[model samples]
Target chain A: MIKVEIKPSQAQFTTRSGVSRQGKPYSLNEQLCYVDLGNEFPVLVKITLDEGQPAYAPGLYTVHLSSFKVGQFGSLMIDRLRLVPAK
Target chain B: MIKVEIKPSQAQFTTRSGVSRQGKPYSLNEQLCYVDLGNEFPVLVKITLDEGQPAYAPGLYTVHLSSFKVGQFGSLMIDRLRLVPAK
Candidate 1:
């Protein structure tokens, strides 16, 4: 269970790049967040916000470090940000 | 199919931090590498160098990029660096 924090100050639309699975050059200017473990440094994260996927709000989230949608360039392309209430 | 380059120049020992699955604090003064997709930007990567895991050498690599052992702080804790021959 890898958990991270999303500060209200940080989640916003940001630009990113990637080549599609179909081999086409692609770009995304979408909602992005910088979430970090307790270590205080953040990793770039993109929450997959579509129907049937989890929605994003400023709070704590627990994600699978195992195929948890982690992407290249130190980014995460996760489908859900399982919101975890603050302890 | 996310492919990246691990140049001969950059795969070297580096300091990083993480907690263990056991919840114990740990340190790894281990071999490390930096790899990146065609975009030219590199991301921190650690090839799990041990018996039964792939050994590290300098070359291009292909990684799953999907739960490809991506860790917090924009680091990848991968078990193997599937070396790709220069094209």
Candidate 2:
């Protein structure tokens, strides 16, 4: 399991590209986020969340990478996230 | 897994009896709730929820019972809960 420490800014609705099961691709607007990696690598992430869930605070979070929903440009997609207190 | 249809009222803090790993029993105040079973059988429930988790509304729900966290008298404790829409 790969993990990355990320700090996310405000959540926003952005256009995303997704593919259908029938080998077709489509674009739609979705609630997405951008994380600051502090010059590690230019990574891209696709955020998925359950309905009626609150967004995490804007601070350093230990992201437990799971699902790679992105099928995007060179940026890696973040599938899961959690927290680890910075000591 | 036992499943039941239940409706819960407002949440309240109540004293609960819990035992330690070495069989040391003690009482503490916990956030608890009472459910209306619609006259099926007299069942007792000890409600447990995560911190900052919202209380479920009193409408009718299909409870997916998992954890039996009760060391209570005659009452069945509810460790988990979910919903089932009524027709």
Measured against the true two-chain complex, the DockQ scores of the candidates, in the order shown, are: 0.06, 0.01
Q: Best candidate, TM-score-wise?
A: 1
True lDDT of residue B83, candidate 2? 30
Write down the TM-score of every candidate: 0.31, 0.23
Top model number, DockQ? 1
Q: Which pairs clash in model 2? A: A44-A75, B44-B75
lDDT of 1 at A7: 69
State the lDDT at A1 in candidate 1. 30
Report the Cα lDDT for residue B31, model 1: 54
lDDT of 2 by residue, B1-87 (tens): 122333454444456577999989866444332333334552344444444545554544433323222223322222343334344
Supply the global lDDT for candidate 2. 0.39
- At residue B18, what lDDT does model 1 achieve? 82
> Lowest lDDT 10-mer window, candidate 2 chain A?
A67-76
Q: Which stretches of candidate 1 lie over 4 Å from their true place?
A: A10-29, A37-40, A50-54, A64-87, B1-87
Off by over 4 Å in 2: A1-87, B1-42, B65-87
lDDT of 2 at B18: 76
